[PDB]
Design a protein around this ligand. Structure first.
Ligand SMILES: Nc1ncnc2c1ncn2[C@@H]1O[C@H](COP(=O)(O)O)[C@@H](O)[C@H]1O[C@H]1O[C@H](COP(=O)(O)O)[C@@H](O)[C@H]1O
Ligand SMILES: [Zn+2]
Ligand SMILES: [Zn+2]
Lengths: 153, 149
């Protein structure tokens, strides 16, 4: 397929598609979100390795490297331990849209939970519990970073 | 249950934009986990001209489990009983998250056109389907007129 495969969980084009041992493909963050519920492969019920979120098999690792240098001028980042993580490309488009329109905030689905992005104070937090807080920023692509959306680089 | 909610919202938007033939669906008020649906009996089916009302309820871990879909309108059919339960493999073990309510609705329309007597939820009706098809069609049309028009 010349096109990026569709994810059977969210019904969108896969973002950071990962391949399970059974060879089904899903967004990394949809797999992560389904892990909170203890799910197996959504399509065939076969096991997802215990360490999959820490060492996922990427459908195209080269495309991750390209994402971490890909959107040209600017990117969005969220706070990690001793460094910044880059937002996934789909959430980044939502943030950019909201920011560019002057919205004070917007909501994002990230790995099975709704987050508020507070664009006035540049912080994100889980909508249900405001204590889970991470600083965000909108900076150039060429900075040091931990990875993209939890995927190491 | 935000994964389910967003998946359901996406299906709704896609359905209301390009609705399946013979079908209508939408949420009950502001509650995305409960929908109502309507099927107009397919042309050339024995159910033609019938209006059938259905209920859809989504599980909190959707799309990992299928929606619960039932007929609220009485119908004469080997795969649909008086409680409105629908005997269809993709609402049981053959559910896949690759499917949508839209696709289930079309499969239900397909079942109306071509019942499956080898999955006999209503045995008496299934036997008539197999032994006397003209009688089956007569009864299905009679019940359509009586209960669904
Ligand atoms: N914007 C986001 N994008 C991707 N995942 C997120 C995001 N926000 C939260 N999560 C994930 O949701 C979970 C709860 O985050 P919390 O408590 O804040 O709501 C976490 O797994 C979050 O993932 C992050 O933290 C992980 C560890 O990185 P270190 O802190 O060691 O740098 C790493 O995977 C990283 O991506
Ligand atoms: Zn997905
Ligand atoms: Zn699988």
């Amino acid at each position: 397929s010349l096109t990026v495969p569709e994810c059977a969980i969210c019904l969108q084009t896969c973002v950071h598609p990962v391949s399970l041992p059974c060879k089904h493909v899903f967004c990394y963050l949809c797999v992560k979100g389904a892990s909170w519920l203890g799910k197996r492969c959504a399509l065939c019920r076969q096991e997802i390795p215990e360490d999959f979120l820490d060492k996922p098999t990427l459908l195209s690792p080269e495309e991750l490297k390209a994402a971490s240098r890909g959107n040209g001028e600017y990117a969005w980042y969220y706070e990690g331990r001793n460094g910044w993580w880059q937002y996934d490309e789909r959430t980044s488009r939502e943030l950019e849209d909201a920011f560019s329109k002057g919205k004070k905030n917007t909501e994002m689905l990230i790995a099975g939970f709704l987050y508020v992005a507070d664009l006035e104070n540049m912080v994100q937090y889980r909508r249900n519990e405001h204590g889970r807080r991470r600083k965000i920023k909108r900076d150039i692509i060429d900075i040091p970073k931990k990875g993209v959306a939890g995927l190491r680089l | 249950h935000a994964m389910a909610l967003k998946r359901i919202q996406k299906e709704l938007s896609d359905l209301q934009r390009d609705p399946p033939a013979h079908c209508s669906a939408g949420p009950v008020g502001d509650d995305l986990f409960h929908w109502q649906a309507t099927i107009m009996g397919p042309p050339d089916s024995a159910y033609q001209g019938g209006v059938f009302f259905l209920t859809v309820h989504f599980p909190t871990d959707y799309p990992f489990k299928p929606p619960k879909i039932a007929f609220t309108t009485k119908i004469y059919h080997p795969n649909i009983n008086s409680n409105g339960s629908i005997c269809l493999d993709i609402l049981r073990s053959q559910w896949s998250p690759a499917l949508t309510v839209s696709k289930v609705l079309l499969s239900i329309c397909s079942l109306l056109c071509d019942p499956n007597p080898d999955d006999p939820l209503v045995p008496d009706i299934a036997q008539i389907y197999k032994s006397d098809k003209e009688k089956y069609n007569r009864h299905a049309r009679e019940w359509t007129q009586k209960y669904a028009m």
